[PDB]
Design a protein around this ligand. Sequence first.
Ligand SMILES: *[C@@H]1O[C@H](CO)[C@@H](O)[C@H](O)[C@H]1O
Ligand SMILES: [K+]
Ligand SMILES: [K+]
Ligand SMILES: [K+]
Ligand SMILES: [K+]
Ligand SMILES: [K+]
Ligand SMILES: [K+]
Ligand SMILES: [K+]
Ligand SMILES: [K+]
Ligand SMILES: [Mg+2]
Ligand SMILES: [Mg+2]
Ligand SMILES: [Mg+2]
Ligand SMILES: [Mg+2]
Ligand SMILES: [Mg+2]
Ligand SMILES: [Mg+2]
Ligand SMILES: [Mg+2]
Ligand SMILES: [Mg+2]
Ligand SMILES: [Mg+2]
Ligand SMILES: [Mg+2]
Ligand SMILES: [Mg+2]
Ligand SMILES: [Mg+2]
Ligand SMILES: [Mg+2]
Ligand SMILES: [Mg+2]
Ligand SMILES: [Mg+2]
Ligand SMILES: [Mg+2]
Ligand SMILES: [Mg+2]
Ligand SMILES: [Mg+2]
Ligand SMILES: [Mg+2]
Ligand SMILES: [Mg+2]
Ligand SMILES: [Mg+2]
Ligand SMILES: [Mg+2]
Ligand SMILES: [Mg+2]
Ligand SMILES: [Mg+2]
Ligand SMILES: [Mg+2]
Ligand SMILES: [Zn+2]
Lengths: 92, 213, 82, 104, 50
Amino acid sequence: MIIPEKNRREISKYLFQEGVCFAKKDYNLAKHPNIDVPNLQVIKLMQSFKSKEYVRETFAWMHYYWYLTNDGIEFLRTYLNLPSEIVPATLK
Amino acid sequence: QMSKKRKFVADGVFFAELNEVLTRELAEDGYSGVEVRVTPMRTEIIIRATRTQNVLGDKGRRIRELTSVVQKRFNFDENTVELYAEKVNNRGLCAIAQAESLRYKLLGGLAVRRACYGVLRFIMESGAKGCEVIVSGKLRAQRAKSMKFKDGYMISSGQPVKEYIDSAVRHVLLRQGVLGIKVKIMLDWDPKGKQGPTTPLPDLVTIHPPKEE
Amino acid sequence: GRVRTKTVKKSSRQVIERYYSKMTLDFHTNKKILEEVAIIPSKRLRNKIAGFSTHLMKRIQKGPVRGISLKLQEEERERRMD
Amino acid sequence: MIHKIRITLSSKNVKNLEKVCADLVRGAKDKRLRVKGPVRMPTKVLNITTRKSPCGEGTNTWDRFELRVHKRVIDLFSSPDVVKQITSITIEPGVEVEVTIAES
Amino acid sequence: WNAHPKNYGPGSRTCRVCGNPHAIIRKYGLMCCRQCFRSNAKEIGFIKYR
RNA sequence: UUGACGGAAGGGCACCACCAGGAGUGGAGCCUGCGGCUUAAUUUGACCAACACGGGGAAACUUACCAGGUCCAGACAUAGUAGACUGAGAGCUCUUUCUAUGGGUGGUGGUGCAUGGCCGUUCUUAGUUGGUAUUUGUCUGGUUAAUUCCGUUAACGAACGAGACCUCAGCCUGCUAACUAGCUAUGCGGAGGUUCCCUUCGCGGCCAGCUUCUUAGAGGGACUACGGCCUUUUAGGCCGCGGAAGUUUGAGGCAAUAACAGGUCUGUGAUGCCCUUAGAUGUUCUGGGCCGCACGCGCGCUACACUGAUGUAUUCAACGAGCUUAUAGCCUUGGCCGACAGGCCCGGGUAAUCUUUGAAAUUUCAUCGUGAUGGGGAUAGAUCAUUGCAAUUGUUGGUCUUCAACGAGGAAUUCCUAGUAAGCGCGAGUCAUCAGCUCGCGUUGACUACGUCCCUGCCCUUUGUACACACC
RNA sequence: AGGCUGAUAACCUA
Ligand SMILES: *[C@@H]1O[C@H](CO)[C@@H](O)[C@H](O)[C@H]1O
Ligand SMILES: [K+]
Ligand SMILES: [K+]
Ligand SMILES: [K+]
Ligand SMILES: [K+]
Ligand SMILES: [K+]
Ligand SMILES: [K+]
Ligand SMILES: [K+]
Ligand SMILES: [K+]
Ligand SMILES: [Mg+2]
Ligand SMILES: [Mg+2]
Ligand SMILES: [Mg+2]
Ligand SMILES: [Mg+2]
Ligand SMILES: [Mg+2]
Ligand SMILES: [Mg+2]
Ligand SMILES: [Mg+2]
Ligand SMILES: [Mg+2]
Ligand SMILES: [Mg+2]
Ligand SMILES: [Mg+2]
Ligand SMILES: [Mg+2]
Ligand SMILES: [Mg+2]
Ligand SMILES: [Mg+2]
Ligand SMILES: [Mg+2]
Ligand SMILES: [Mg+2]
Ligand SMILES: [Mg+2]
Ligand SMILES: [Mg+2]
Ligand SMILES: [Mg+2]
Ligand SMILES: [Mg+2]
Ligand SMILES: [Mg+2]
Ligand SMILES: [Mg+2]
Ligand SMILES: [Mg+2]
Ligand SMILES: [Mg+2]
Ligand SMILES: [Mg+2]
Ligand SMILES: [Mg+2]
Ligand SMILES: [Zn+2]
């Protein structure tokens, strides 16, 4: 899945900014309701995180629910290059 | 603005979908139900679970994740919806909790006969009028069969079933296929309305003892 | 058919056993008594019990019945024989 | 000074709806406000009839599902602030309260 | 890719619970297939009286 | 010994049995489902308890089938290094600026004889089971819709089913109370008749009054209560007054034990194993097919006319459903344009508020006149409009024309006991468009019976049995 | 060819 580096940052930025994300299982959807990135690229990128245990996945009624994990926060900070004192919105 | 017919249906669909999302997210935390208390300026969601310490997480981390994802998914205004965990007062009278309790025993490896009697014995000790556990599927042989564990009082027909019977159905995904768990608990008449229904059984007639004064 | 079940017959006998003094030969008065001296969940069940008990009160007037134990009536019989 | 304020209550549970209506009428009779209602609109019976079988085999049996909506309308002749005080009381679950200034 | 119009017809609508396109109940905006609705009817608030 | 079975017996029972009947179906045309045939494909499941069933009314999508073109929507881990064509420039060059290995994932792929769940059926009957081989309890008899009860009694005392129960309908001039429901009175106004008065219609009044009519909460009401007779002191039954109601008042919902290799893997991010996974059974795009027509069958629709068709006049329902407001996506009033179909404009309604001032059969007058006729409307030509990206293999709706069988249906066979059958239309589901279907609703409104075990079955007892895969 | 039967034979109809 070749996600543009600009779109990849937006997903990681949003995911790190808020420790949760969701998506409708609709690959045709043009834009994610919370991110400019296309809906498909959100679903596939967080599939990569699910395989590396950076997120925890739930599915129900045609919707994905992803939750950041401790390792995911560790990874995203290095990728986004942010101060170690910043944490997702769910940890405050 | 939408008509009353669609608004009530939309409220029912939100409750049904929220329960399913929590039924899977909190499967191994004793999730037993939810109550949606919509009020002005705030909608309160009360999560019932036998083990609340695992639903809240460390310092309430998990309950905040559930609140955040629920608010975004269901188009709620930020800081306008709250989730509160709560404990089931009598875990042995909740069929949904016993069905999930039986589920994890079977997954762990406990024998079906022993696991089903542990639930059946626990429910009757908790003050139930009766209980019935049914397990169906490929137990040991290739061909499927049903085992029924029954104890005490039980009813099947009529209106009272809706008030006096607490039933749940769950699927156990074992290595040879799927087992079906059915827990059916008959409650006892509780005038206070907490342990069981306050209305008595239709055919139960009580004669007051006469007084000698 | 109009056969009364065990629920109606059993309850009626119990009422007449311990409230025979209160009961009367009138259906309308008897069904107001059942509200006072018993907890009958439904109105239809209360009417059938009141109607059958009123039937049993008429039975007792003519003589003794099988399943009803009236102590004061029993004492009268014992004095008669003795 | 005095305005006709309309309060609309909707619910699936009759007992809860009737309980809240009595609490509002009785809560307004304490302030000696003129009260019109409660007016009970005809019950809306949503109905879904569906095949019981998940497949098409067997006798064609049907489930008739009904979701009843009960609606009450109460008119209070008073100022908005006073009405806001009466309705501010905690309402029973599932009863939807809606306060509007009657257009008359 | 996905160019064909999907503004009307069965292909546009799917079950909100399971995603299946068949036997959708559109009345009152339920948007559930008939099988999923029967399973979730009690939770939604629908009841059998007669 | 238990079951099952019997062209064994006894008792009882059911319009998915019959009797007495009504409407029919089976015959015609057509609609739709199934088989067969044909086909590139005409995807497929199912054979009382399959066959207008899979909510399966498929133009695309649906879609599983057929002819072709794309795309990766192959996580994670390890090691390695403007032209030609075409249905369409879809892809491929030009120009401008990944590959193995494992391990996954998807699949309406297979197996419902590996499964869960759900549903159907045995089975609409009254049946089933503990405690103290199997049996008793759980019964000779009476009684009941009922293993319902009265009694009998080596059983006693209990658990389920039945009943109770819950929903709708039927009574309330009594309660609560209504500018989103009305009535009565009054005031003003219009019209008619004789200024008052009378008849009728319109409008107004949160200070006319009120709740009969409407709505919906709470209650009441039937218990066979009362009378006669029959039954054992019983349980109960028949008839009758009164009563809204005297079949458990009517109709439903729920509904035991034990089962079936019943249906569904094509409802499901229910699911085991198996198959396939980039010249894919994944996915998407274009086109075709699912509808293809010597024939057999099932559910139906329309008919064969005068108890009618046609043309007038006239006139009364109930259940229900409805929008993103973008110029406007839903239900649509009113005005205008048009023969119709339909179009334009101003609007109402997220609804007891607006559509809704809301049907048909029927009633009424006239024409037709026993002639396949003005019965019937299949088949077919021409043409117009609407839905849609797209209408051809006619989507549907109009106009004129065309004007088939069919004259009441063989053997056989279905449903039904009262606001029922039948007739009559309406809403809802499906739905951009499409109803001969289904689920409900009201309108008109009967014949016959109040039985029986003859046929088809069912329950209980006795009895026979070489059957137990249980008389297939 | 149809009907009768769960199905075949027999039987009945066209
Ligand atoms: C689980 O426990 C809750 C306690 O409130 C009860 O309401 C549910 O019925 C039961 O299944
Ligand atoms: K016929
Ligand atoms: K069918
Ligand atoms: K099954
Ligand atoms: K006048
Ligand atoms: K299934
Ligand atoms: K499978
Ligand atoms: K479906
Ligand atoms: K024609
Ligand atoms: Mg019971
Ligand atoms: Mg019952
Ligand atoms: Mg009969
Ligand atoms: Mg028959
Ligand atoms: Mg006959
Ligand atoms: Mg006919
Ligand atoms: Mg034929
Ligand atoms: Mg025919
Ligand atoms: Mg049958
Ligand atoms: Mg197609
Ligand atoms: Mg296609
Ligand atoms: Mg495919
Ligand atoms: Mg699948
Ligand atoms: Mg099977
Ligand atoms: Mg009234
Ligand atoms: Mg009442
Ligand atoms: Mg049964
Ligand atoms: Mg099979
Ligand atoms: Mg077809
Ligand atoms: Mg049919
Ligand atoms: Mg004609
Ligand atoms: Mg009318
Ligand atoms: Mg002619
Ligand atoms: Mg079509
Ligand atoms: Mg259909
Ligand atoms: Zn579904």
